[PDB]
């Protein structure tokens, strides 16, 4: 992260060893549940890509979880250099320059550089892009690592219908289907695989029920 | 029914040998269902008398049918000569005369007539009335051949839905109840003679609610 000396300057602060303690620990008790993404996003708050790539060292035993994250960063470093093409011409003395693709990565940018980039009127974050990037890399690996389909989530015959509910929603957050087919899953799916006497009820209830009523009307069932 | 020539005139022109076999395959292998009527409406589309007597020629054999539809179509007579009262008086050389029960019907009428009285600006349907009170008199015959009430029509334990809906419905439109008593044996007994799972659910439904509705509740049920 970046803090400020007591001259009043943007200074690089190392994340904490507990901190990374911590990541470590999501890395490798977690097997890359859904639940990963929020703590990464959590665990790296106003991160710098120096240490966004310390992070990542954490993966690299993984090794395709961080070919998948290395593909990802890639291609985002390319449609980045695409989009924001090297400008030739002067420079302004105050102003500085464009970072490429490999320079928000951290690649061959310095600690500085991005110090400076990051902390500016208006500021450009590129710690918060790269975050996203592997946030998107992290979707793709839960994607991969997802044990069951939504369309084997059944509810138990004795199972309380919250907890089938929980079970239903976290494998739809790991699958990360399209908006319009998440809505059709939630609105049919859910009612069809349910264990009769809830299905019974949730078809009385009828279609465009909201999700608090039917677990009202399921509560006890 | 009618055509017109080279000359510009109407003409007569009979069914076509194949129209009549449909007709006689109608009669002779349905059992006189429902069907035979929205059958016979389609099969005698735009026809004069002497078309509907040779159509009539083939319920013949069926000795009650038969008699039912002449009942019927006496009692339509003598109610359009007691309606339409023969007027003593002058004709207009070209209007022509006002036919009977016994004209309509093409017991004593010839083909010309029929034709001049069917075209005409404004025209009068003889076709159609004729038609009319075959129909009323099949409706009747559908009446007695019906082989079950609608009290009797009750939803099997595995029977889909939408098949049950199907054979209340046929059997209500052959009992031609009262329209009243149509509505309320839709409203209640089709809810009531339905097995326990759609009872269910239908009666969580509550009043009022709409077939498409209560097929949409029911459909895998």
Redesign the interface.
Known sequence: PIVQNLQGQMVHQAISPRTLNAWVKVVEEKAFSPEVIPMFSALSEGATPQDLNTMLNTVAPHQAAMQMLKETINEEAAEWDRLHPVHAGPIAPGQMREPRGSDIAGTTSTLQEQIGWMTHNPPIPVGEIYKRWIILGLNKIVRMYSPTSILDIRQGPKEPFRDYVDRFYKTLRAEQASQEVKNWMTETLLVQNANPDCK??L??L??GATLEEMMTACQGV
Chains 1, 2 share one sequence.
């Open positions: 019974t009820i078809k009385a009828g279609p």
